[PDB]
Design a protein around this ligand. Structure first.
Ligand SMILES: Cc1ccc(NC(=O)c2cccc(C(F)(F)F)c2C)cc1C(=O)Nc1cnc(Nc2ccc(N3CCN(C)CC3)cc2)nc1
Length: 256
């Protein structure tokens, strides 16, 4: 293959962009087709918006992080406008899905299931010594069979999902993902509502420093709430692993 193309290269002609799923800063995201019959998602780089290499580092990363619980890389097009193509999740973002007529009717059993699924994906990430840095419902995709996969739309880390040592020292580890995950759990159980209902960031900041944690969300299973508490332990080293988290969630799930 020529040097000016990636090992994962495909001709642009094999792709047809049909629907804009989101636009913005560094490019856009489209739902499309690969060779007509195969649905795909396509992230396109807004020229000059950021370095092509900078853009393409994400795909090089996904090359080493292939797993069924994570969005799979399909190919790339490295001639402007640069594209990164992945599989296509039909039910969109978890935050949006939890609000559709279907998502709203999801039982606590299904929710715990999806939580374990995400924990499973985070367990793989943990095993590979990678750090997500933005684990939230907004970065979780749902399939037509209602299965979840971790993603990162690459969108100042907004406080509410960011652990103390991260907000204060900029130090991110798999232990801060564990914290973010605890927050993700509130989104799941409340069908997508923003964490810390009615509190501004500095209020959340002052509360955590005092040792306070988020008020028990409405209708949240107390066992689930306590599991969230573990994710919010002061010392990063006292927070659990994702294998443990997946493990407990599977038990709550199989008990419901
Ligand atoms: C195109 C693309 C290219 C790349 C990526 N990359 C990632 O993730 C990613 C990045 C870094 C690290 C990691 C890892 F560590 F976890 F490995 C990942 C993993 C994501 C996408 C990417 O965004 N893919 C995608 C988008 N939409 C959909 N479906 C999708 C999304 C939203 C809706 N929506 C419903 C209709 N509503 C109008 C708009 C929202 C409907 C389908 N399915 C897949």
């Amino acid at each position: 293959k020529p040097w000016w193309e990636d090992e994962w290269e495909v001709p642009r002609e094999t792709l047809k962009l049909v629907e804009r799923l989101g636009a913005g800063q560094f490019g856009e995201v489209w739902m499309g087709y690969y060779n007509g019959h195969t649905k795909v998602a396509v992230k396109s780089l807004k020229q000059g918006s950021m370095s092509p290499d900078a853009f393409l580092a994400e795909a090089n990363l996904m090359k080493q992080l292939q797993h069924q619980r994570l969005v799979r890389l399909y190919a790339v097009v490295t001639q402007e406008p640069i594209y990164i193509i992945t599989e296509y999740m039909e039910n969109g973002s978890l935050v949006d899905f939890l609000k559709t007529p279907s998502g709203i009717k999801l039982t606590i059993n299904k929710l715990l299931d999806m939580a374990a699924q995400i924990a499973e994906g985070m367990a793989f990430i943990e095993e590979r010594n990678y750090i997500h840095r933005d684990l939230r419902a907004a970065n979780i995709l749902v399939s037509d069979t209602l299965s979840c996969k971790i993603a990162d739309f690459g969108l100042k880390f907004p406080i509410k999902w960011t652990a103390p040592e991260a907000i204060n020292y900029g130090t991110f580890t798999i232990k801060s993902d564990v914290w973010s995950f605890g927050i993700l759990l509130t989104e799941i159980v409340t069908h997508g509502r923003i964490p810390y209902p009615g509190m501004t960031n500095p209020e959340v900041i002052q509360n955590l420093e005092r040792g306070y944690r988020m008020v028990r969300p409405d209708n949240c299973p107390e066992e689930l709430y306590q599991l969230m508490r573990l994710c919010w332990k002061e010392r990063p080293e006292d927070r659990p692993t994702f294998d443990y988290l997946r493990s407990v969630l599977e038990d709550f799930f199989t008990a419901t």
